[PDB]
Scaffold this active site. Structure first.
Site, PDB file in Angstrom:
ATOM      1  N   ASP E  54       0.757  -1.195  -0.067  1.00 46.77           N
ATOM      2  CA  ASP E  54       0.096   0.134   0.081  1.00 46.77           C
ATOM      3  C   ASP E  54       0.963   1.392  -0.088  1.00 46.77           C
ATOM      4  O   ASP E  54       1.593   1.441   0.652  1.00 46.77           O
ATOM      5  CB  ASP E  54      -0.891  -0.072   1.181  1.00 46.77           C
ATOM      6  CG  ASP E  54      -1.815   1.332   1.368  1.00 46.77           C
ATOM      7  OD1 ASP E  54      -2.763   1.439   0.471  1.00 46.77           O
ATOM      8  OD2 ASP E  54      -1.646   1.974   2.125  1.00 46.77           O
ATOM      9  N   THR E  87      -3.624   6.911  -4.398  1.00 48.16           N
ATOM     10  CA  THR E  87      -2.515   7.421  -3.700  1.00 48.16           C
ATOM     11  C   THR E  87      -1.333   7.332  -4.515  1.00 48.16           C
ATOM     12  O   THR E  87      -0.676   8.241  -5.045  1.00 48.16           O
ATOM     13  CB  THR E  87      -2.341   7.286  -2.156  1.00 48.16           C
ATOM     14  OG1 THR E  87      -3.413   7.454  -1.479  1.00 48.16           O
ATOM     15  CG2 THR E  87      -1.062   7.986  -1.859  1.00 48.16           C
ATOM     16  N   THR E  88      -1.003   6.076  -4.945  1.00 46.27           N
ATOM     17  CA  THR E  88       0.182   5.635  -5.657  1.00 46.27           C
ATOM     18  C   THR E  88       0.207   6.233  -6.866  1.00 46.27           C
ATOM     19  O   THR E  88       0.923   6.899  -7.725  1.00 46.27           O
ATOM     20  CB  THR E  88       0.186   4.233  -5.764  1.00 46.27           C
ATOM     21  OG1 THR E  88       0.515   3.660  -4.412  1.00 46.27           O
ATOM     22  CG2 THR E  88       1.738   3.580  -6.489  1.00 46.27           C
ATOM     23  N   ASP E 393     -11.465   0.452   1.115  1.00 43.48           N
ATOM     24  CA  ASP E 393     -11.245   0.453  -0.506  1.00 43.48           C
ATOM     25  C   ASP E 393     -12.441   0.450  -1.131  1.00 43.48           C
ATOM     26  O   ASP E 393     -13.109   0.996  -1.947  1.00 43.48           O
ATOM     27  CB  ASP E 393     -10.152  -0.123  -0.877  1.00 43.48           C
ATOM     28  CG  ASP E 393      -8.866   0.320  -0.166  1.00 43.48           C
ATOM     29  OD1 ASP E 393      -8.876   1.168   0.591  1.00 43.48           O
ATOM     30  OD2 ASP E 393      -7.699  -0.459  -0.851  1.00 43.48           O
TER      31      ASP E 393
END
Lengths: 41, 48, 519, 195, 528
Positions: E54, E87-88, E393
């Site tokens: 994550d 986010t990534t 999520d």
């Protein structure tokens, strides 16, 4: 996945030669055109 | 397709060195000169 | 047996002045990106690891607090400017840095700092005179303290629904700010009410405060609808046959006792209602509902009442009429009664709307808008809010000078012209000050991504002829008349900024040596 | 500087080199002890007053401190063998070290992410397990004795429970519910109806 | 102030240093992009080792002295709530944009122009996404529910819970339905409580229609369950905040007994107060006493004698959850307690999960409620953490899908389409806008290349094939082999990403790029 091992390191020599050639090219570049800068040697 | 497209794109990008060098040596703004040349090439081919 | 310098000495003379100049240059370079609305931000990490990103010059100076004595003086002058004025701190710092830069070559050539300071003072005097001359305060040129506000309101409402009808709304917007204390302007003091029905051009301007109908009990339309000597009094918790506040539940097992108690309470309410008349309260307002008994008594006594008044509307009405809010009727005093020239209910919109008019001493006003639909009135209200904000900003400083470097360009041109008639050593200092004044437009152009050299050259060429309001346009890279575009800055702020910058320059250049004692 | 407290992410090249080589090095601590003819290893304390010699892979792994995080992860993952079986930890560690060494050699020959290597290892492990299952033999001859033992065990377990109402009947039911499956004995294969 | 040990960069190395720092930060989680992204080892200062890919978790636990990196990490921390699973991708896109801005600056373009051009390119890309988006809810309700469940299953399958992830997806969907209404189409996560503990298995997940309140009932003899009383009107709850004890001094206390008179007086006072409180509780008709504070020994004895199970130390948020679930009200004091303010619930009983012997207390409604709790269990702490993250999520994805019917497809197909559109539009706009659009398109190209690299595919050939397929033939949803798939064209693989999610990713990436670029001077003092 699996690709060529690339045990040798010709990249170092190739990059050194490319760097030298690019340095020479940059040195010669500024003389292009009628308004090119003069070079003193 | 493949690496050919990327290498052709890089070659085309590198081809712009000559006009950039001419603009720099002439004291003109490189970005302005190249943008104006590309804009004028929408109608002309080589005369601009 | 005590040594403060630890055996460390320092040089004195032009060397220390040059070191101070270098420190000022460092500070100016640090604060350069923050100049102008398009400037870049600076990230500072404190000793506590707190990270702050901001563009305001005051915050950056407070967070940095450079220990260098010249930088300390610059920071002190900037803080003084911010506290006394609050605008131009970054401009003051930039001007001081530029003046210090210009002073360096003169010192290197052997020019005494006293001559430089005297020339800077003379340049400041000339610049102040030229700014005062350039400052716009005109009456016969189709502009004034009120007409200019109307033009600003029209510009704000440009490309809007009411742009074609701005000729009437500009007057309303200007009067809204001018109808209250002109030395204390606040948007919260200008209210707007939406009344359906009628054309937008029929909107009414109310000197006092107006609000929609709030009374819905017996006696409606049974009380006077016009008052020539009204007395506004806000009574909190009465206006009922039975007590509403601080009451209690009473259970009675006998009909006679309950009837007697109710009759006694009704008699008490009767006495209180009579006292209401005895207090001379012709208009009775309250945030809570008013009972039928009170309304009937007031109607029989030619007294107007209206309950269920919103807190904001009640407060605005009280402030406009100069009255107060009384807890009880028995405590009503004459000093708590407000009066207006005329109070009446407006029937526009198929409904009665309360409004107070003819009260020039009111601290707040209300705007009544008309239209064929609520959406049209909402758009009109938005345009009026924009115009009100713009006119308030304009009126806060009626003495204005062309912005976007126009004032700086004019001052520089005037100083350059004067330098041809000040033959002597002062010419170099005058020219240096004129050149330094041009830093502000240069840095503004650089921070905005424009071609600083070309823009500056074009501005200098243009300013030599035509109007004196030519400046830099930051919407699209070009130059033009900023005044015609309604872009300007206060003259007093600019004068104060120049004075502060020159004071800092004189203070720093007047120091020949600095001695630090261990502590 | 990143993170802190001496806990920082290492360069990608050195990070991968550690992840592989250090994890493989754990096997060398127990490789010599593999099999009944394994060698002995000396563990020396700082004071030298509590040093001892042992040939147990689990003891060697749990006693010798491992500074490299990769070795810690490898040992923690291999610890499942002790709970599952309680023996053969040396074999698990040696096999893991050999797999990691082979994967490192493959990466040196490909210089590509080992996700394909992971998939290949999964497929090879599945094939090897299938072959092992095929090569297994059954020593459960005389299933009648096993059934009798199951009946006795069921009777023993049913004691002190609500099922003690008919001990023999419930023991027979439990024994049948396991024997007649002729396959997986998981509770999912056995349904209980409560009425 | 604190001039010593102060470092700064401005004019020469500021832009290069900032861009290099951003690239270094991005490279931390670049390899973790996609469902098959490589994991990273995170070790606590106490030596606890954890493994996860994550990006948000990796960046959140990373502290550093670099100002640009700190700003990027702080922005990612706030963005984690807005999107969570993006986010990534946002970090990678911002890093690519900064890399392109490096070259643009090297060509003489001012940072403000680069930022404006990136903003325009983001607007064009969002417009293209809107044009190419498809509606699921407007096609079929059955298909919409199927896609919701598929998204939840896809989110859950990346973790250990993949064995029985269906239950988690069903619980998440039920919680979203119970808590979210279609008036706003926004899930109130504050009303969806996340709770769990180590132990049990992945099949022990349960959705509760009210607060848990795993309390010990204070007194050992206090009953641990509140039964419905054989068909009675559920269980009546006394929601109280005043402690169940008489007022006491805050300085000395030591109310000891020395003689008969003092004993009689103190007992009279205390017993009168306790009797008043207990009589108020009984008159209210509540079956269970819930107080924000603890209970005294006398209060506990009286409640036990009257068969009134007690709940101690219930938090304010817990009280609000009780009120919402039971349609009750919070009574400040005992004297203000009445039957008109008591809440109703189906039962208050102990629930066992797997082999757990704690017998936690749970308040159950069994009906539709505006507040629910997602209970998560597992054989290990890592399993519980992964299950909670996957549930979060899935909830975010479901909220995004319900909020906007328009959706896009993953695997980089949307990125490729946006890149193609931006490249086509670049040649139409003259000036620095052309360079900005080309840079934005190249940055968009980064995401599919990174995904291909993480999947073991060649980014160059993969990206070229995707562009050829999406340009020569037609515009479709063709991505990289993020997971084991028979072929390309995710459209048939049912890999769907919400349109709002992608729009937020692009907007946040652009905002982060602007924030990093707009800083031209960094000053940091020393440390004590």
């Amino acid at each position: 996945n699996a690709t060529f091992k690339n045990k040798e390191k010709p990249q170092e020599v190739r990059k050194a030669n490319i760097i030298a050639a690019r340095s020479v090219a940059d040195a010669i570049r500024t003389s292009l055109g009628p308004k090119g800068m003069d070079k003193m040697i | 397709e493949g690496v050919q497209a990327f290498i052709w794109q890089e070659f085309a990008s590198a081809l712009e060195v000559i006009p950039t060098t001419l603009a720099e040596n002439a004291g003109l703004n490189s970005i302005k000169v190249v943008t104006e040349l590309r804009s004028k090439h929408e109608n002309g081919e080589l005369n601009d | 047996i005590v040594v403060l310098k630890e055996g460390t000495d320092a040089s004195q003379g032009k060397g220390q002045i040059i070191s101070n100049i270098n420190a000022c240059v460092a500070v100016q370079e640090a604060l350069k990106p923050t100049l102008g609305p398009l400037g870049s931000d600076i990230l500072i990490v404190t000793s506590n690891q707190k990270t702050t990103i901001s563009n305001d010059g005051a915050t950056i100076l407070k967070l940095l607090d450079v220990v260098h004595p010249a930088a300390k003086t610059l920071v002190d002058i900037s803080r003084a400017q911010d506290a006394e004025v609050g605008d131009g701190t970054t401009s003051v710092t930039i001007l001081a840095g530029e003046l210090m830069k210009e002073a360096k070559p003169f010192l290197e050539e052997g020019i005494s700092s006293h001559l430089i300071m005297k020339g800077y003072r003379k340049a400041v005097s000339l610049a102040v005179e030229k700014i005062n001359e350039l400052a716009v305060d005109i009456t016969s040129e189709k502009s004034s303290g009120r007409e200019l506000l109307e033009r600003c309101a029209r510009t704000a409402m440009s490309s809007k629904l009411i742009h074609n009808n701005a000729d009437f709304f500009v007057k309303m917007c200007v009067d809204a700010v001018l109808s209250l204390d002109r030395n204390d302007l606040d948007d919260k003091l200008i209210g707007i009410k939406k009344i359906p029905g009628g054309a937008m051009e029929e909107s009414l301007f109310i000197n006092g405060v107006a609000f929609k109908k709030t009374f819905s009990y017996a006696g409606f339309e049974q009380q006077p609808k016009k008052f020539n000597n009204p007395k506004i009094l806000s009574l909190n918790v009465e206006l009922e046959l039975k007590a509403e506040k601080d009451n209690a539940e009473v259970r009675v097992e006998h009909v006679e006792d309950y009837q007697a108690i109710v009759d006694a309470e009704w008699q008490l309410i009767f006495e209180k209602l009579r006292q209401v008349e005895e207090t001379g309260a012709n208009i009775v307002l309250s945030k809570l509902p008013i009972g039928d008994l009170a309304t009937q008594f007031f109607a029989d006594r030619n007294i107007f009442c209206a309950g269920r008044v919103s807190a904001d509307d009640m407060n605005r009405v009280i402030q406009a009429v100069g009255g107060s809010i009384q807890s009880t009727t028995s405590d009503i005093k004459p000093e708590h009664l407000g009066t207006c020239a005329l109070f009446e209910e407006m029937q526009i919109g198929s409904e009665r709307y309360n409004l107070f008019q003819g009260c020039p001493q009111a601290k707040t006003c209300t705007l009544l808008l008309r239209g064929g639909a609520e959406q049209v009135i909402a758009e009109v209200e938005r345009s009026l809010h924009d115009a009100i904000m713009i006119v308030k900003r304009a009126l806060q400083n009626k003495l204005i000078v062309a912005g976007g470097g126009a004032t700086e360009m004019e001052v520089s041109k005037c100083l350059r012209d004067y330098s041809k008639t000040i033959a002597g050593k002062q010419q170099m200092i005058i020219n240096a000050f004129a050149k330094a004044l041009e830093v502000i437009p240069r840095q503004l152009c650089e921070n905005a991504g424009f071609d600083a050299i070309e823009i500056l050259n074009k501005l200098r060429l243009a300013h030599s002829k035509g109007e004196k309001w030519y400046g830099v346009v930051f919407e699209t890279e070009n130059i033009g008349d900023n005044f015609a575009k309604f872009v300007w800055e206060p003259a007093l702020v600019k004068i104060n900024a120049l004075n502060s910058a020159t004071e800092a320059t004189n203070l720093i250049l007047s120091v020949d040596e600095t001695i630090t004692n261990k502590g | 500087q990143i993170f802190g407290d001496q806990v920082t992410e290492e360069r990608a090249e050195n990070a991968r080199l550690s992840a592989f080589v250090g994890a493989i090095a754990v096997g060398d601590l127990v490789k010599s002890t593999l099999g009944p003819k394994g060698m002995d290893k000396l563990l020396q304390s700082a004071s030298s007053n509590t040093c001892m010699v042992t040939n147990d892979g689990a003891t060697i792994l749990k006693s010798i401190p491992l500074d490299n995080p990769a070795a810690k992860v490898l040992v923690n993952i291999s610890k499942v063998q002790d709970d599952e079986v309680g023996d053969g930890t040396t074999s698990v560690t040696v096999l893991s070290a050999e797999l990691l060494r082979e994967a490192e050699k493959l990466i040196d020959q490909s210089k590509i992410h080992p996700q394909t290597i992971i998939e290949g290892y999964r497929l090879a492990s599945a094939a090897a397990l299938d072959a092992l299952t095929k090569a297994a033999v059954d020593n459960s001859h005389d299933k009648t004795m096993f059934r009798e033992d199951l009946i006795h065990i069921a009777k023993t377990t049913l004691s002190s429970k609500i099922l003690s109402q008919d001990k023999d009947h419930f023991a027979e039911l439990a024994t049948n519910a396991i024997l007649r499956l002729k396959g997986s004995t998981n509770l999912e294969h056995i349904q209980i109806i409560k009425i | 102030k604190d001039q010593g040990n102060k470092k700064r960069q401005h004019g020469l190395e500021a832009k290069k240093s900032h861009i290099l720092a951003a690239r270094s930060v991005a490279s931390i989680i670049k390899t973790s992009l996609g469902p098959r992204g490589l994991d990273k080892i995170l070790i606590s200062p106490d030596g606890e080792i954890t493994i996860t890919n994550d990006g948000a978790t990796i960046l959140s636990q990373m502290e550093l002295d670099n100002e640009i990196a700190k700003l990027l990490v702080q922005l990612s921390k706030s963005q984690d709530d807005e999107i969570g699973d993006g986010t990534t991708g946002v970090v990678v896109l911002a890093s690519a944009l900064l890399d392109q801005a490096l070259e643009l600056i090297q060509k003489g373009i001012h940072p403000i122009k680069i930022a404006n051009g990136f903003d325009e390119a983001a607007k064009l890309a969002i417009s293209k996404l809107e044009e190419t988006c498809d509606d699921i809810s407007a096609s079929n309700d059955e298909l919409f529910r199927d896609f919701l469940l598929r998204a939840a299953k896809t989110s859950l399958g990346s973790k250990i819970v993949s064995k029985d992830h269906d239950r988690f997806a069903e619980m998440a969907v039920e919680a979203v339905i119970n808590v979210m209404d279609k008036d706003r189409k926004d899930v109130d996560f504050d009303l969806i409580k996340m709770q769990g503990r180590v132990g049990g298995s992945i099949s022990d997940s349960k959705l509760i229609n009210g607060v848990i309140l795993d309390k010990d009932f204070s007194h050992p003899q206090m009953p641990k369950c509140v039964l419905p009383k054989e068909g009675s009107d559920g269980v009546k709850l006394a929601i109280l905040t005043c402690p169940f004890e008489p007022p006491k001094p805050k300085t000395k206390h030591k109310l000891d007994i020395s003689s008969v008179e003092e004993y009689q007086k103190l007992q009279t006072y205390e017993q009168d107060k306790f009797k008043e409180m207990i009589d108020d509780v009984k008159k209210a008709g509540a079956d269970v006493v819930i107080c924000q504070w603890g209970f005294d020994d006398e209060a506990n004895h009286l409640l036990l004698q009257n068969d009134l199970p007690a709940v101690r130390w219930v938090g304010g948020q817990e009280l609000e959850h009780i009120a919402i679930s039971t349609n009750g009200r919070i009574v400040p004091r005992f004297q203000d307690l009445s039957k008109d303010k008591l809440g109703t619930c189906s039962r208050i009983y102990e629930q066992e999960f797997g082999t757990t012997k704690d017998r936690m207390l749970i308040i159950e409604q069994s009906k539709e409620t505006k507040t629910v709790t997602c209970f998560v269990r597992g054989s290990n702490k890592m399993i519980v953490d992964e299950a909670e993250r996957a549930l979060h999520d899935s909830l975010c994805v479901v909220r995004n899908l319900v909020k906007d019917s328009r959706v896009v497809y993953g695997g980089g197909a949307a990125e490729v389409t946006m890149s193609l559109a931006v490249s086509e539009e670049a040649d139409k706009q003259r000036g620095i806008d052309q360079y900005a659009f080309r840079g934005f398109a190249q940055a968009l190209d980064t995401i599919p290349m990174t995904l291909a690299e993480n999947s073991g595919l060649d980014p160059i050939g993969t990206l070229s094939t995707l562009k050829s397929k999406q340009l020569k033939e037609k515009i479709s949803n063709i991505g990289v082999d993020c997971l084991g798939y028979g072929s390309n064209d995710m459209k048939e693989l049912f890999v769907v990403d919400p349109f709002i999610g992608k729009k937020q990713q692009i907007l946040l990436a652009t905002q982060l790029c602007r924030m990093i670029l707009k800083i031209d001077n960094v000053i940091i003092s020393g440390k004590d």
